[PDB]
């Protein structure tokens, strides 16, 4: 025979090893591949699509699980009200759990890129307003003043024909890639925080709802890229499949 000398790893079975294996059906031919609409090539093609972000994820009544998608915005009175706040980390157990992008991240360990989040006002057409949506980069604690929040990356929004408006979270990090932040220590990869304040007030005429709602859609920018991978920690099966 031919002089061989098997090295370590012999007879081992690696889950993620790309290798060959004997064919079970000599001369088999798969049924022709018909053309089918909307085929996918890369997963990053999905991260581009915006999905409903559950900011108002407090309710869990099971009868009020549908309001987790919406968002409250009443006609305040004071100057500088805070409307909402939430984590800027996608693969975190925060509100980004609902977003498609978020669920995908659970299958990857690290990422990179900016993030877009469009907000759409559903209130009556007569409803007018102006609001300051801010983004406090990592290291900055949750602002307490609409004046302390505007010191970071923000964007004022006015209501009208263009119901929606998108806020872009520029990838501002110290590392090329970020690991999914999870409190203790692993917060070194936090993307920061996002706050929303009333620039003016929810002005409404006589005869229109005194309270409206907003919907947040999240997605990733083109410069977005994930690396590595793993099993999702966003969901776990309690009982065995029947």
């Amino acid at each position: 025979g031919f002089p061989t000398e098997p090295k370590p790893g012999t007879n081992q079975f690696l889950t993620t090893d790309d290798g060959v294996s004997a064919p079970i059906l000599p001369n088999f031919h798969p049924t022709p591949c018909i053309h089918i609409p909307g085929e996918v090539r890369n997963l990053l093609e999905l991260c581009q699509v915006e999905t409903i972000l559950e900011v108002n994820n407090v309710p869990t009544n099971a009868t009020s699980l549908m309001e987790r998608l919406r968002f409250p915005v009443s006609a305040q009175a004071g100057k500088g009200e805070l409307c909402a706040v939430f984590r800027a980390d996608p693969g975190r157990d925060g509100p980004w759990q609902s977003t498609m992008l978020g669920q995908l991240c659970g299958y990857y360990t690290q990422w990179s890129g900016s993030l877009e989040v469009t907000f759409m006002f559903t209130g009556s057409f007569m409803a007018t307003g102006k609001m300051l949506i801010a983004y406090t980069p990592p290291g900055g604690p949750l602002p307490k003043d609409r004046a302390t929040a505007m010191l970071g990356t923000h964007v004022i929004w006015d209501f009208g024909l263009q119901s929606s408006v998108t806020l872009v979270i520029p990838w501002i990090s110290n590392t090329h890639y970020r690991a999914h932040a999870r409190d203790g220590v692993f917060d070194y990869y936090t993307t920061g925080l996002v706050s929303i304040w009333y620039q003016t007030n929810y002005v409404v005429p006589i005869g229109a709802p005194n309270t409206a709602y907003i919907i947040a859609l999240a997605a990733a920018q083109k410069n977005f890229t994930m690396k590595l991978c793993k099993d999702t920690s966003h969901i776990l099966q309690t009982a065995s499949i029947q």
């Binding site: 999905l46 157990d93 119901s163 929606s164 408006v165």
Partner: protein
């Protein structure tokens, strides 16, 4: 000679409009320099998702950005680079004592919807065409490596299924069988895309019978024969008792993947196999909940 209507009519265009082309994308988009801009008529930020399109607003038009060369590769976020990873999808039990699998043989139905991990990923798309590589890990309930010999035989739908540890069907004169010892490494097998349908179907919104669909027959809703690959049989090569308590675990890896329509991830806990039935009495939120939308 021509009614003109027949000449004009485009009826018969096998060519799809498309209107969207796939372009190269090894490195993520590179950001470019951007200075300030103050003008009317230009509203990059202002969008209207009411249309059904993901805001096309770019970083530059939002803040004075710098220039960055994205070297970050997107090769690991591809289909093959994702699905092509071995995972548990099957598990057979051939114990000595018990009511589950006596006699020494076992006929497992070819279906992977029996395990979470794998089922979650795959059910992300609606259709999927591909080849696979199966590995067989045989061992006792403890981890004990036993000098036993087995015979794995594939039984296509319509082929004689073994009925006993010594059924004639094990001659496997046509069917593909594999004989291995528990001392030798696991079995390596390559399987081609076999199905009357151009691609496996994860969700079948219809009935395969085409009959009355009575209540007692609602057991068929969702069952697609194009995913029925027959069964898998295994047994000890002998006339007597096995002498050992065995447990085979089937692992699968996908090669040459082709996914199509994408759908929402799984929200609830899987209950049945090939059944999107969920825990209706107790539904849980997609993710974690907070105490107030104004508090972290």
């Amino acid at each position: 000679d021509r009614v003109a209507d027949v000449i004009e009519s485009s009826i018969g265009d096998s060519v799809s409009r498309a209107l969207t082309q796939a372009l190269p994308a090894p490195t993520g988009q590179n950001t470019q320099v951007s200075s300030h801009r103050l003008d009317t008529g230009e509203v990059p930020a202002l969008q209207a998702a009411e249309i059904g399109a993901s805001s096309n607003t770019s970083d530059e038009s939002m803040i004075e950005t710098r220039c960055v060369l994205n070297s970050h590769s997107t090769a690991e976020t591809t289909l093959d680079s994702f699905f092509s990873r071995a995972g548990l999808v099957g598990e057979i039990d051939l114990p000595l004592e018990g009511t589950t699998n006596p006699n020494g043989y076992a006929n497992w139905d070819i279906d992977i919807t029996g395990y979470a991990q794998m089922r979650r990923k795959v059910e992300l798309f609606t259709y999927m065409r591909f080849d696979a590589e199966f590995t067989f890990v045989a061992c006792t309930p403890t981890g004990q490596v036993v000098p036993q010999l087995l015979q794995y035989m594939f039984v296509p739908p319509g082929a004689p299924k073994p009925e006993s540890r010594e059924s004639l069907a094990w001659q496997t004169a046509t069917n593909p069988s594999v004989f291995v010892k528990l001392t030798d490494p696991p079995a390596q097998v390559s399987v081609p895309f076999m199905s009357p349908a151009s691609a496996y179907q994860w969700f079948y919104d219809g009935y395969p019978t085409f009959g009355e669909h009575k209540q007692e027959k609602d057991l068929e809703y969702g069952a697609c024969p194009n995913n029925m690959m027959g069964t898998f049989s295994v047994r000890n090569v002998g006339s007597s008792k096995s002498k050992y308590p065995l447990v085979v675990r089937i692992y699968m890896r996908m090669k040459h993947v082709r996914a199509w329509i994408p759908r929402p991830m799984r929200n609830q806990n899987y209950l049945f196999k090939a059944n999107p039935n969920y825990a209706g009495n107790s539904i849980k939120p997609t993710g974690t909940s907070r105490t107030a939308i104004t508090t972290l």
